[PDB]
């Protein structure tokens, strides 16, 4: 049974060791600050090693799948995608409002009870919004390899602009794609571009199978230094009701509302999907990061689904980017929880325009350095609440992040198989001719 | 006619419509500034894309051009090319200093009357030139690609130096010459990134050819609020006579002096040349940039007028770099004006180290986040005056500038066609042998 | 003989002349820190052009030099290299120790008399070391190329981090290390990167060979603006016994250590191997930096000792960023001679710490702003010694470093050919089959 299923057994036992040493350290012994920050060195290593693979594998992935189509078949394989990345974002709002209306879990809990933690940025709509075209389209090519653009409103009013650490995917991809179009039409002008980034992608995909082999000593880590983190247990249980409300919301998601698409869709078994997907689901749940398990969301849906390349690189860093089921359920459940916390009642108008918010919000923002806390600053400024209630949702964050990525790589994973199901005749087609 | 000349008529059509939109606008409706700025968010989503296409184009253009010559042949279309740089600006300073000490605009005008706006920066000429040194040879590489360096005097002082945003297409632009002409003697051991290189050129020419189906809705509204800007009318008839002349100084350059040198050159009639360039002298005119609009002229140069890729590939960047016809003619009669503004006499002397301060600060000064405002300080330092006297001049910046890029780009087009005649023979025993 | 060693010839004038100039400038004039800075700007020009190869040709060079071996051959040749390396800076420290113990410099010199220069800054041990192998393994592969990577210590402590200037080679070259063994076994899947980055490789050295035209004026003014700064001589006989022995350790090291070693393993005369690294060991001697003389190491090691292409590729960088003979055996000097300077006793314990703080810190410090002064200080608190201490030493810090960056050189020379012997059968196996 070894040297077949050694990673997959390997992370298991490294999830349970790192959960029952958290458990025994935080327990049976105090840690200053410092000591707990050295504790987790090896999960940084890990992490800083996963963020390094990101770039390479996107641009060459990116390019390499939009110019083995014909433009044509790429266009339809894109709006397939998109449709699909729509509606189910939507569904997943629209059940995570149902289901947090229906709990009412604000009503009993009161505002003064709940303690409060961290520190509420300051956001502007209208300047997030027209930030986020910006990055859509950046200035300097290598710039937008590490960096992002913000603009902030300062003083009868200018808007003054600045560039940030960390890396703007969202440029990177809209630049990779139609660079990728552009190359493919050029025919055997543009083949030697075609083979250097081919033989990048292969190269990257080595890299990641190399890191592969440290992946479970970090994970241990990671999961053991989240553990320690929390200093005591009284505000899990003040804020039960409502993790038990987006759990619930997460879990009725995954498995009931996409499998039963799936199943519609392609007349197949789901469960069987997300068994070959499992790997990459414990990636998600254990790093917390939809972009750094890229690399294992497609080994597994290649080796083991047996999905087409070209559909796989094409749908799946697109799906990375603006596919965020879990985290528009999560803003959802948390904005009506803050309105029900305080003394405000909520209209259908204002049901509406959450959801709607929730839907646009989480679609568009693809990565900010506190991404989750501005697009819920975002929603509650729509519904009308004050920015600083984030304060009483932060503690648990943390926590329900791995949630909300595991959902969202099931997502991804189970689109993938749509569309290739989708578009059957198309790459037929094309491959005879 | 249509299907041929639909870009042109779009841009004229644009022009005409931003023109009438902008007058209606800011004559019947008052407008606070983060409302104007928020008016012209399509230019600044056309300007950041054309910003985009810098890097890559200049870099495999220069390359490109370099490796397909001898490295012969090379030296005397780069000496060629440099006389006739340097003997047109010369003339154009000529010409900007006879004009405004002729015609004596600040006799009347009196210092006190005029407003001032903005602020001066502090310059040190020494300083200045070792920069320009220092840039011409770059520490990274790609620290260039989106950098530049800067030297300031601080405390009995020390020069201490830092990297600020702004891409530094000087040291680009002399390492592509260096690197393509060492890898077009290596022969068959190099061919691989002449192929590499040529390719990425035809890519981003073809995603340029993308951006000019979006490029006339930004147009309109860059030509839009550039209108809107304008408080009032008065500071422009107060400075009416300055425009006149710097206008008179241009329109004069541009009909008389570039057209007879061509006409002496090459036996053609130089306004069907004019004509053919006419797109890019109105995106010149429009976008205010000559770097942004060098595909454009590219375009233009080689479908148009039917000009060698070989001379074209290599003399228009240069061209655009550090030829600055325009710019030395705008700072001689701006400095001149203030001179005659205050109760300072000018000798001869005085006028041969203003005109040889302007001639070689705006061929030396290729791209600064402030650079027009520089090079105007430092010949101000030159003659003398304070560098508090810019002030006056900032009003009508923003409308002048576009004039004047668009006599730099005129004045590139006419030289690559002088180059392509004077260089006739090379060519032809090259392609024979 | 012209036209063959024109180069040094014309180097060993440029290093007579500067000193000459040097002294007589000193000495019949004064100047002020500002013409001081002004004088040297030649030198500045050079280092500046120097620095620009780096990059390139380190990630070309390792690529191709890992690419070019098999999986085998690479591992036990890496494995030489590092044994030799460590064993190499062990006993240059060892050297060190003995000489700085049996020659007691700072007994009879007083602290109170010694003057006091710069600015000592704040060091971490534990965050040095920590910060270090975060550097091994970079986050974003675009900004390690400009850029690194630090943590520091705020308030009951958290430790944030910040990325400021500066290359960070260590992670390149890991990074270099891992993708040319990756692409080497692709085989017919990775051939045109292989090709791609030897013809980037060819390109870069070349050049190199351009700039060597320039090297001998810059050469002139680095080393007489190096002459000119030091402000009087009394602080030179203060410290002349501590130059003394360090400058003692320094050439017997070089003089007998290493040929013995090489003369051991491969029978030839080491002088002669010497001779032919002379154009590198002054270039060493006068720009003080191991990274920016690689390139003149690598073409007198390659024409002039026959040394195989393989071995030397793959060695040579890798020597040039960890082996640091003569800086640790600098570090033990002044740490043993700080000690000697207070009323303080050092037993056998404290001199075993000391040793293997030195040979650990110099091989992992590889390129900080300030290395040297930061491992000093790691090494006075090893000792348990004030940073403070540092002061006493750095004015004849810019006098030492060339001989310290020479012996590092010649160390890499010699131990690129003693691999080259050990490995002779593997060369012989691979190229037969
Ligand atoms: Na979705
Ligand atoms: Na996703
Ligand atoms: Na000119
Ligand atoms: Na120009
Ligand atoms: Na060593
Ligand atoms: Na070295």
């Given at each position: 049974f070894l040297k077949n299923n050694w990673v997959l057994l390997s992370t298991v036992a490294a999830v349970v060791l790192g959960i029952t040493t958290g458990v025994l350290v935080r327990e049976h012994s105090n840690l200053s600050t410092l000591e707990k920050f050295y504790f987790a060195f090896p999960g940084e290593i890990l992490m800083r090693m996963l963020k390094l693979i990101i770039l390479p594998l996107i641009i060459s992935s990116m390019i390499t799948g939009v110019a083995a189509l014909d433009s044509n078949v790429s266009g339809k394989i894109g709006l397939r995608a998109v449709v699909y990345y729509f509606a189910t974002t939507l569904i997943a709002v629209i059940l995570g409002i149902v289901l947090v209306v229906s709990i009412k879990?604000?009503?009993?809990?009161?505002?003064?009870?709940i303690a409060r933690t961290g520190s509420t940025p300051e956001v502007s709509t209208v300047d997030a919004m027209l930030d986020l075209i910006r990055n859509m389209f950046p200035e300097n090519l290598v710039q937008a390899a590490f960096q992002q653009y913000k603009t902030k409103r300062e003083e009868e009013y200018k808007i003054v602009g600045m560039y940030s650490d960390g890396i703007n995917v969202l440029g990177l991809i809209v630049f990779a794609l139609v660079f990728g179009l552009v190359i493919g039409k050029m025919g055997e002008k543009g083949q030697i571009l075609v083979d250097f980034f081919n033989a990048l992608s292969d190269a990257t995909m080595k890299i990641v199978q190399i890191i592969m082999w440290y992946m479970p000593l970090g994970i241990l880590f990671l999961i053991a230094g989240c553990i320690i983190?929390?200093?005591?247990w009284e505000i899990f249980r003040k804020l039960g009701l409502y993790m038990a409300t987006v759990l619930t919301g997460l879990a009725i998601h995954s498995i009931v509302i996409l499998p039963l698409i799936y199943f519609i869709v392609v007349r197949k078994n789901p469960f069987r999907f997300a068994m070959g997907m499992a790997q990459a689901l414990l990636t998600a749940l254990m790093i917390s990061s939809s972009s750094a398990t890229l690399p294992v969301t497609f080994r597994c849906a290649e080796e083991n689904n047996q999905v087409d390349k070209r559909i796989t690189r094409f749908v799946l860093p697109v799906g990375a980017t603006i596919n965020m089921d879990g985290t528009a359920l999560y803003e959802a459940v948390a904005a009506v929880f803050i309105a029900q916390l305080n003394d405000l009642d909520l209209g259908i108008g204002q049901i509406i325009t959450i959801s709607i918010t929730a839907t646009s919000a989480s679609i568009g923002?693809?990565?900010?350095?506190?991404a989750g806390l501005v697009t819920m600053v975002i929603v509650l400024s729509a519904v009308g609440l004050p920015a600083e209630d984030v304060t009483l949702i932060i503690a648990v964050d943390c926590l329900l992040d791995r949630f909300r990525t595991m959902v969202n790589v099931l997502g991804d994973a189970f689109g993938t198989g749509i569309v290739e199901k989708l578009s059957k005749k198309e790459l037929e087609q094309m491959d005879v001719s």
């Amino acid at each position: 049974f070894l040297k077949n299923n050694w990673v997959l057994l390997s992370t298991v036992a490294a999830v349970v060791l790192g959960i029952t040493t958290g458990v025994l350290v935080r327990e049976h012994s105090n840690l200053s600050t410092l000591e707990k920050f050295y504790f987790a060195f090896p999960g940084e290593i890990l992490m800083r090693m996963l963020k390094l693979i990101i770039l390479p594998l996107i641009i060459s992935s990116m390019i390499t799948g939009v110019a083995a189509l014909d433009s044509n078949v790429s266009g339809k394989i894109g709006l397939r995608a998109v449709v699909y990345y729509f509606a189910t974002t939507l569904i997943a709002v629209i059940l995570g409002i149902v289901l947090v209306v229906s709990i009412k879990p604000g009503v009993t809990q009161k505002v003064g009870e709940i303690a409060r933690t961290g520190s509420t940025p300051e956001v502007s709509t209208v300047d997030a919004m027209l930030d986020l075209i910006r990055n859509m389209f950046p200035e300097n090519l290598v710039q937008a390899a590490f960096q992002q653009y913000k603009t902030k409103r300062e003083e009868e009013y200018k808007i003054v602009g600045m560039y940030s650490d960390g890396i703007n995917v969202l440029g990177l991809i809209v630049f990779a794609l139609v660079f990728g179009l552009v190359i493919g039409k050029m025919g055997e002008k543009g083949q030697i571009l075609v083979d250097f980034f081919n033989a990048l992608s292969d190269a990257t995909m080595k890299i990641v199978q190399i890191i592969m082999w440290y992946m479970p000593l970090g994970i241990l880590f990671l999961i053991a230094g989240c553990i320690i983190e929390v200093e005591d247990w009284e505000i899990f249980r003040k804020l039960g009701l409502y993790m038990a409300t987006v759990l619930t919301g997460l879990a009725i998601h995954s498995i009931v509302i996409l499998p039963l698409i799936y199943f519609i869709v392609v007349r197949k078994n789901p469960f069987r999907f997300a068994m070959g997907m499992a790997q990459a689901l414990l990636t998600a749940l254990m790093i917390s990061s939809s972009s750094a398990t890229l690399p294992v969301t497609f080994r597994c849906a290649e080796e083991n689904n047996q999905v087409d390349k070209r559909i796989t690189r094409f749908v799946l860093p697109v799906g990375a980017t603006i596919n965020m089921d879990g985290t528009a359920l999560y803003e959802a459940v948390a904005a009506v929880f803050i309105a029900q916390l305080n003394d405000l009642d909520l209209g259908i108008g204002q049901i509406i325009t959450i959801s709607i918010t929730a839907t646009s919000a989480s679609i568009g923002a693809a990565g900010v350095p506190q991404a989750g806390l501005v697009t819920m600053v975002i929603v509650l400024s729509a519904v009308g609440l004050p920015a600083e209630d984030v304060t009483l949702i932060i503690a648990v964050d943390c926590l329900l992040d791995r949630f909300r990525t595991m959902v969202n790589v099931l997502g991804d994973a189970f689109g993938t198989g749509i569309v290739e199901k989708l578009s059957k005749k198309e790459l037929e087609q094309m491959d005879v001719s």
